[PDB]
Amino acid sequence: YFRLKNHGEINASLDNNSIEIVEISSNGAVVVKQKTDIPKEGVLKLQIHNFIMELCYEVIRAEDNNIVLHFTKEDETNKLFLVLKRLRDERKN
Ligand SMILES: [Cl-]
């Protein structure tokens, strides 16, 4: 697979509260820790250009101020994969 650095095409929120995403793959993401300690398990809302979805996630590693999320549902990671593959091709121009 592959990871993508966020160049601002990617916005995310948890329980309608926005979070900073800095890297993403079909199987997970690296996000920045905020004041509100985010749930160990939950639903992340992802927006990429005109595409919006929700992904079940869990926190699997906390590294300094970054949090590593794992997306737990295969069918949801399959959908995400295709969106990321589109976004990656767009950067290729
Ligand atoms: Cl909801």
Automatic annotation (TrEMBL):
Cross-referenced InterPro entries: PilZ_domain
One Pfam family recorded for the sequence: PilZ-like
Domain PilZ: residue ranges: 3-92
Gene3D superfamilies tied to this protein: 2.40.10.430
GO MF entries: cyclic-di-GMP binding
Protein name: PilZ domain-containing protein
Originating species: Legionella pneumophila subsp. pneumophila (strain Philadelphia 1 / ATCC 33152 / DSM 7513)
Source taxonomy: Bacteria, Pseudomonadati, Pseudomonadota, Gammaproteobacteria, Legionellales
